[PDB]
Amino acid sequence: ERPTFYRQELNKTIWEVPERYQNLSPVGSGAYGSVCAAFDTKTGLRVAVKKLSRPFQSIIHAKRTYRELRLLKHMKHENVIGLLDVFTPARSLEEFNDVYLVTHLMGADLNNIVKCQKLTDDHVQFLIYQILRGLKYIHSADIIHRDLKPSNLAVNEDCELKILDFGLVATRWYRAPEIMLNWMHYNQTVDIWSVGCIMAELLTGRTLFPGTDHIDQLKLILRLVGTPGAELLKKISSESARNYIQSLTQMPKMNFANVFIGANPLAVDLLEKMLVLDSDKRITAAQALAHAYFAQYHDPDDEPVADPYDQSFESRDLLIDEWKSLTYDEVISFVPPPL
Ligand SMILES: COc1nccc(-c2c(-c3ccc(F)cc3)ncn2[C@H]2CC[C@H](O)CC2)n1
Numbered sequence: 001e002r003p004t005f006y007r008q009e010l011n012k013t014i015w016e017v018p019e020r021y022q023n024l025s026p027v028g029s030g031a032y033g034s035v036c037a038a039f040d041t042k043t044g045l046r047v048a049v050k051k052l053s054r055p056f057q058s059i060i061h062a063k064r065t066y067r068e069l070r071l072l073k074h075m076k077h078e079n080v081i082g083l084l085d086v087f088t089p090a091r092s093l094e095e096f097n098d099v100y101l102v103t104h105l106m107g108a109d110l111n112n113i114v115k116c117q118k119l120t121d122d123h124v125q126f127l128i129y130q131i132l133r134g135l136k137y138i139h140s141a142d143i144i145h146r147d148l149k150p151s152n153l154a155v156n157e158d159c160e161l162k163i164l165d166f167g168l169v170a171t172r173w174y175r176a177p178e179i180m181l182n183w184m185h186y187n188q189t190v191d192i193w194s195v196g197c198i199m200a201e202l203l204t205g206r207t208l209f210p211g212t213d214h215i216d217q218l219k220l221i222l223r224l225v226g227t228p229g230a231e232l233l234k235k236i237s238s239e240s241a242r243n244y245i246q247s248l249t250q251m252p253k254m255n256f257a258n259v260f261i262g263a264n265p266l267a268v269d270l271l272e273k274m275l276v277l278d279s280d281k282r283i284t285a286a287q288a289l290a291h292a293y294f295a296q297y298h299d300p301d302d303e304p305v306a307d308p309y310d311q312s313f314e315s316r317d318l319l320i321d322e323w324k325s326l327t328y329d330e331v332i333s334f335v336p337p338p339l
């Protein structure tokens with residue numbers, strides 16, 4: 001029981017897929033893979049098919065490939081990209097060198113939405129609500145996204161949103177200041193900082209912190225939220241990070257009600273809770289969902305958490321063939337979701 005595959009070359013890339021997937025149309029490419037829109041004749045669904053690029057090029061690529069497949073197989077939530085299918089044209093482990101991932105076609109990203117004029121407060125509520133609902137789920141599996149940005153948020157014509165964990169403008173614009181300072185013990189609230197930046201941008205139509213580099217990025221952040229107070233400075237072990245931060249002209253926290261004047265005061269209150277410099281004081285996804293700003297969407301009985309997620313593989317140092325074999329086992333054990 002193996003489907004019939006057919007091959008085709010699209011934009012320099014060869015695609016070998018099952019006959020069920022028709023009318024492949026390139027959507028975009030990147031360092032880690034390329035994506036085509038297609039029509040799935042078995043389900044009647046429009047899908048996006050991602051072909052991984054050089055999945056076993058090195059130990060790093062091989063572990064990344066396994067990581068992505070494991071993550072995607074685990075994510076089962078309406079606001080997180082999951083898998084409809086995964087396949088390989090390879091007939092055996094020995095000749096296994098290509099991995100294809102299939103999900104529901106979304107068709108646009110959040111950047112396309114903010115670009116095409118500004119949104120109503122109701123749209124901001126709905127979009128951010130969905131991000132947080134997806135994040136609550138991801139975070140409950142002890143996963144940190146780490147690179148939330150508009151381009152990693154897929155959105156369909158119904159304004160339904162799904163978080164893309166990977167990852168085929170600048171990432172740094174949405175990155176938590178503790179990451180810009182290279183803190184190795186950052187927590188899940190790095191993602192809340194990013195949601196704060198995204199929400200600000202949806203409300204104003206402008207990138208909140210458009211830094212030109214890591215130093216400029218930190219400078220832009222501190223100008224809005226103020227330079228660190230005593231409680232936060234005490235948590236910084238890095239002497240250079242402290243010499244830098246403390247050698248900057250001291251700056252107060254700006255009045256958010258003034259900076260985002262015109263916005264819904266509930267949105268401004270939430271933003272202030274997300275864009276707190278000290279990650280230990282930043283609101284969590286679960287807490288954010290209960291915020292008054294989302295009263296028309298919040299339902300505690302329908303904001304589910306994830307099943308336990310085993311990431312013990314992350315601490316493993318294996319050979320390429322071992323990561324390849326594990327990935328292969330995960331391709332073969334895949335059971336599609338019910339139609
Ligand atoms: C184009 O429609 C669509 N829908 C769902 C996922 C993906 C996807 C995926 C993707 C991820 C997993 C998968 F199984 C299938 C596709 N990776 C990146 N994207 C998009 C590509 C365009 C870009 O603007 C936004 C990310 N694409």
Ligand SMILES: Fc1ccc(-c2n[nH]cc2-c2ccncc2)cc1
Pocket residue numbers: 177178181183228232235236237238241245277278279280
């Ligand atoms: F300027 C800044 C900006 C952000 C931070 C910060 N927020 N949460 C944790 C930290 C942090 C940064 C560096 N080292 C430990 C902790 C600290 C100083």
